[PDB]
Amino acid sequence: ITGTSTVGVGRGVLGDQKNINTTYSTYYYLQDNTRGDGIFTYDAKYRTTLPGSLWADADNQFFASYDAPAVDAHYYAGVTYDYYKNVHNRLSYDGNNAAIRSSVHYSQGYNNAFWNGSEMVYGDGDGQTFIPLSGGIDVVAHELTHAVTDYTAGLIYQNESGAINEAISDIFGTLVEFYANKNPDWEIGEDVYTPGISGDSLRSMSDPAKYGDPDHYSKRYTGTQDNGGVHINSGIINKAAYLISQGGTHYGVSVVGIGRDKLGKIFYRALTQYLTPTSNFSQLRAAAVQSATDLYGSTSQEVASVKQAFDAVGVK
Ligand SMILES: [Ca+2]
Ligand SMILES: [Ca+2]
Ligand SMILES: [Ca+2]
Numbered sequence: 001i002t003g004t005s006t007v008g009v010g011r012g013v014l015g016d017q018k019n020i021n022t023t024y025s026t027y028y029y030l031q032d033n034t035r036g037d038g039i040f041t042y043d044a045k046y047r048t049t050l051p052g053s054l055w056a057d058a059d060n061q062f063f064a065s066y067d068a069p070a071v072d073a074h075y076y077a078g079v080t081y082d083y084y085k086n087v088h089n090r091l092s093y094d095g096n097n098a099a100i101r102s103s104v105h106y107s108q109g110y111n112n113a114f115w116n117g118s119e120m121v122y123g124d125g126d127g128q129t130f131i132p133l134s135g136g137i138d139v140v141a142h143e144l145t146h147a148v149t150d151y152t153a154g155l156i157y158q159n160e161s162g163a164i165n166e167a168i169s170d171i172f173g174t175l176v177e178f179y180a181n182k183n184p185d186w187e188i189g190e191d192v193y194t195p196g197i198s199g200d201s202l203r204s205m206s207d208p209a210k211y212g213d214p215d216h217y218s219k220r221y222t223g224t225q226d227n228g229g230v231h232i233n234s235g236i237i238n239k240a241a242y243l244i245s246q247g248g249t250h251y252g253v254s255v256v257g258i259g260r261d262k263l264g265k266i267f268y269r270a271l272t273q274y275l276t277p278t279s280n281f282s283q284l285r286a287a288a289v290q291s292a293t294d295l296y297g298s299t300s301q302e303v304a305s306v307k308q309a310f311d312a313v314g315v316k
C-alpha cells in the first residue's frame, strides 16, 4: 500500500491518547512512512495466520477499544525505533532500516507476545493475567530488542547465553521506557500484567528476588525449564545493569551509579561488538568492561562501577 502521509490519533491500551503516522488511501492505515523503511500494523482478527490485514480505519480516529492495541503496537514500535536511531544511531533492528511489522489480535486470550524473526506478533491477554501485550512499551521493546540481538551477537536462547539475551531485552526495553518518558520504572510488564493487581510485574530489575528471581550468581537456576532459566537468571544481569546505572549496596558490595545513558552505551556496545552466540556471564562481564574501557578509559569510574556491579552479583 501506497498513499498520503497523515497523522491520526487514538487512544492506547491504557486509555492514553496519542498520535500516529498513518497513510491514507480511501481508508486510513497503520502505516508510518516517517520511519525508515516504514512501520505497519496489521489486524490478525483472532486468527493465527500472519500478519492479517494492514490496519484500515475509516476516520483516522482510533478510539475504539478494538483499536487500542494496534495503536500501541504501532506507536511503541516507532518510539522504539527513534530510540535506537537517535541513541545508538541504529536504523531499525537490522540497522538497515528494515521495516517493522506488527500483528495484533492474534488468536484468542493469548498471553504472549513476540518477535517471530520476521515480525511482531501480539496476543491480547485473557484479561486476568494480561491485557493486550502491546500495551506495555517495555514489552514491545524487549521483544524488538531480540531482533536487534539477532542481528548482532546472535546469542542463543538457552542458559547463560539465553539469560543475557533476555537481560539485554529487559535492559533496552527499560531504556526505551525511560526513553518515552511515561511511567518508566525498573519493572517489566508492569503496565499489562495482572490487571487486577497493582504494584506487581513479571519481574524487577531493581529487586529480582521480589519475584523470586536470582540476584546473585550463587543463586543461578540450573534447571531445565524456561530454557535453562532464561527469564529467571536474567535477574542476575538485571541487578547488575541496574546497579551500574543507579548504584547501591548489594550483598555488601557498593556500586557507584553512572546513569541510564552510560549503561545504555556500555551495553549496546558490548553487545554489538563483543558478544558471541555463546557468551556466558563472565564473558558478559568481560565485554562490558572492555566496552566501558573503549568508551571511557581503563581507569574510568565507569569501568570501575562496571566491575563493582558484577563483583556484586558474583559474576567474575
Ligand atoms: Ca475510526
Ligand atoms: Ca513503567
Ligand atoms: Ca517497566
Ligand SMILES: [Ca+2]
Residues within 6 Å of the ligand: 190, 192, 193, 194, 195, 196, 197, 198, 199, 200, 201
Ligand atoms: Ca498488575
Ligand SMILES: [Zn+2]
Residues within 6 Å of the ligand: 142, 143, 146, 166, 169
Ligand atoms: Zn524475551
Ligand SMILES: [Zn+2]
Residues within 6 Å of the ligand: 166, 231
Ligand atoms: Zn520472554
Ligand SMILES: [Zn+2]
Residues within 6 Å of the ligand: 249, 250, 251
Ligand atoms: Zn541488594
